[PDB]
Amino acid sequence: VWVVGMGIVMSLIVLAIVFGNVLVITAIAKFERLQTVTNYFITSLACADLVMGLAVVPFGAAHILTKTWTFGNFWCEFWTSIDVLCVTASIETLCVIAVDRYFAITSPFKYQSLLTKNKARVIILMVWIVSGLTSFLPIQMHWYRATHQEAINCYAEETCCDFFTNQAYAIASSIVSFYVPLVIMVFVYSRVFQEAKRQLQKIDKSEGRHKALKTLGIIMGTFTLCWLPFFIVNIVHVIQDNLIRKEVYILLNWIGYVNSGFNPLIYCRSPDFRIAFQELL
Ligand SMILES: CN[C@@H]1CCc2c(ccc(O)c2O)[C@H]1O
Description:
Elements: H1 3-30, H2 39-66, H3 73-106, H4 111-114, H5 117-140, H6 149-156, H7 167-206, H8 212-239, H9 246-257, H10 259-267, H11 271-280
Helix pairs in contact: 1-2, 1-10, 2-3, 2-10, 3-5, 3-7, 7-8, 8-9
The protein binds ligand G1I.
């Protein structure tokens, strides 16, 4: 009375993610007026979200609904690697976009000199490579493997897939993937807000006879509310093994997945994108 209908939500999420990401990619690729150095970061972010929505989500949905993993252990390890890869790549691309905006507003004359067409490709490749070294290299060689008896029983059996991780791997991965980008983005947006307030005050002083707050609020709040509650419990549940159950962890992780769907509605609402979308349909 629950399974026969609760798959509708997963189907809707999959459809929304795939449609939004493919529409953004098609709009950027097809029309030449959208070709910009800043738009390449959005292209990489959309590609990461598309891969996530095409691979990670359906298999997880099958895992919860069926409650068994029909496929082998090799596919389980591959799925975990893809999950970690996509998550960290997306979160790092967000910080890259924020730093680009910081450089755009803070230093207006030499914005062009710092970043060109060729440098963006190198930045994106380095971001994806650092993302890859976090997931595939440790998982495939079995560095994260736990040691307690329940983990051994889960790992030996070929029909169960429960994520058991070492303390050191969890801490290092969380620090590399979330907290450093969080700090960088906070500092960047604080400086940007200060500059905007100064300019607004200058204009009001010039023309003798509030708006950036909402713009910063959407971007900060969406990311923080979507990805902060997951990493708190991720860090906590390794130090103490009795506080956090195995269902709240899954619920928070799936809450974090939805953040891929909201990215096109935040970073791709410019008017030129509106003309591009209107022309397509
Ligand atoms: C199966 N879910 C995984 C488990 C742990 C983990 C995730 C995402 C980013 C990380 O850095 C992680 O360590 C989650 O998506």
